[PDB]
Design a protein around this nucleic acid. Structure first.
Length: 54
RNA sequence: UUUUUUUUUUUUUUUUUUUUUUUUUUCUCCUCUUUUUUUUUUUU
């Protein structure tokens, strides 16, 4: 479980980039399920990163 | 005996206004027959 988190943060970028395409076309049927996936993917272990973040 | 790297949720907020129910048409139009008109009066 070291490459799973990196695969996750690679997937979330393309799902964050499909919204701009659905908005460009004008088809929010997919642009809504991409927003739901984007909010359904964000966990807290992903953002842990380093020790002295803040 | 299968390594290394590929960032992410638009920036902004400390804008004035001194009025008053309604609202605006329809034309001139043959009234039939015992009458002058009776009348005081009293019991409410």
């Amino acid at each position: 479980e070291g490459l799973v988190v990196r695969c996750i943060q690679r997937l979330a970028e393309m799902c964050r980039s499909l919204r701009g395409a659905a908005r460009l076309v004008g088809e929010p049927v997919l642009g809504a399920k991409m927003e739901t996936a984007a909010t359904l993917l964000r966990r807290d272990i992903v953002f842990a990163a380093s020790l002295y973040t803040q």
